[PDB]
């Protein structure tokens, strides 16, 4: 069950090294980037799986509003409405534990 996040890391590393705007907006690279970030956001929104939540959070929590964080917060809303309370608490504990800039993780 750990192979999932292994390959997640091994793939997403080859996409967003530093920013999302390092590849110019409105360009094929940027366009595919917005496509894939939407794909993860929705698939996870349905899934409500933690590890994906963190991964997309820290990659989001590098540059302020570079990966369309309105979708990010909306995904939080549609997740926190769904799911069992214990599942939500598990996600919250995981994203709390990932806390240990470094600040911006929880902040956003």
């Amino acid at each position: 069950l750990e192979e999932l996040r292994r390959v997640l890391e091994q793939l997403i590393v080859a996409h967003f090294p530093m920013q999302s705007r390092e590849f110019p907006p409105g360009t094929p690279r940027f366009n595919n980037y917005v496509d894939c970030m939407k794909k993860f956001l929705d698939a996870l929104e349905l899934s409500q799986s933690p590890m994906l939540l963190e991964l997309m959070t820290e990659v989001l929590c590098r540059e302020q509003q570079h990966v369309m964080e309105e979708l990010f917060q909306s995904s939080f809303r549609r997740i926190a409405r769904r799911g069992s309370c214990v599942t939500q608490v598990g996600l919250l504990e995981s994203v709390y534990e990932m806390f240990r800039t470094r600040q911006s993780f929880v902040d956003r």
Binding site: A14, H15, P17, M18, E22
Partner: peptide
């Protein structure tokens, strides 16, 4: 990914490329 960018950059215009 921009690793390849500068790798091809420094030998596509043959400059030290600070």
């Amino acid at each position: 990914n921009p690793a390849e960018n500068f790798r091809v950059l420094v030998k596509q215009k043959k400059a030290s490329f600070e």
